[PDB]
């Protein structure tokens, strides 16, 4: 998994899995566009990386 503020950080570039938060609290298309507050990574498709 990526680190924080690293060269691969999810907060900067995007989540590692499509419509799945890095934390894993939100893992569905319903939370699209919602930035999770525990880890600060937006729930979007992986292609945005």
């Amino acid at each position: 998994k990526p680190e924080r503020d690293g060269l691969f950080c999810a907060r900067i570039f995007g989540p590692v899995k499509d419509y799945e938060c890095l934390c894993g609290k939100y893992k569905r298309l319903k939370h699209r566009g919602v930035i999770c507050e525990k880890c600060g990574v937006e729930v979007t498709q992986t292609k945005v990386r």
């Binding site: 060269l7 691969f8 570039f13 990386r49």
Partner: protein, 48 residues
């Protein structure tokens, strides 16, 4: 973007690192060292 410089798994517990990632790591380390030494009131020669 990270996808343009992927970390392809080697199927043996290791990760193949592209040259761009290594160069970026070098630049980041050098910049962090420069900031740390600037915060340390280092002499002019060391800062240069």
């Amino acid at each position: 973007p990270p996808d343009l410089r992927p970390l392809v798994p080697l199927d043996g517990g290791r990760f193949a690192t592209s040259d761009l990632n290594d160069l970026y790591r070098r630049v980041i380390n050098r910049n962090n060292r420069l900031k740390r030494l600037l915060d340390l009131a280092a002499p002019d020669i060391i800062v240069r």
